[PDB]
Amino acid sequence: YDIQAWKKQCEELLNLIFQCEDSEPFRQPVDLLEYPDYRDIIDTPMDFATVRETLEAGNYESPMELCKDVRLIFSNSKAYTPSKRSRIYSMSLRLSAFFEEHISSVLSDYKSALRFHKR
């Protein structure tokens, strides 16, 4: 029933993601010299360094907010990909499965802890 526990859980999940080769494309911003049309397709860039920095700045109130930004990384990859069999998109889908597998308990425990606080 620890209402704060999600934050370290998210820090340790981001550490796992940063160790994962599938996160390589999603750590830092997209260079427009390399993808000149990226912002013609993607309105709101997002990457795992920005998620980690937002977390470490104390600028997430809940793991749901972190989960919306992580999911935006994946939806951007799906929107930008020219093919569902692209290398970078294919890395996004595996990383997304890994992230959803690990975040499900973090969200559950947080919401459980809030409910207990409100009881």
Ligand SMILES: COCCNC(=O)N1CCN(C(=O)c2ccc(C)o2)CC1
């Ligand atoms: C080493 O990473 C450098 C920073 N990252 C990127 O440059 N990008 C990551 C995001 N992204 C895509 O999701 C995507 C889908 C299909 C294709 C071709 O790219 C565009 C490339």
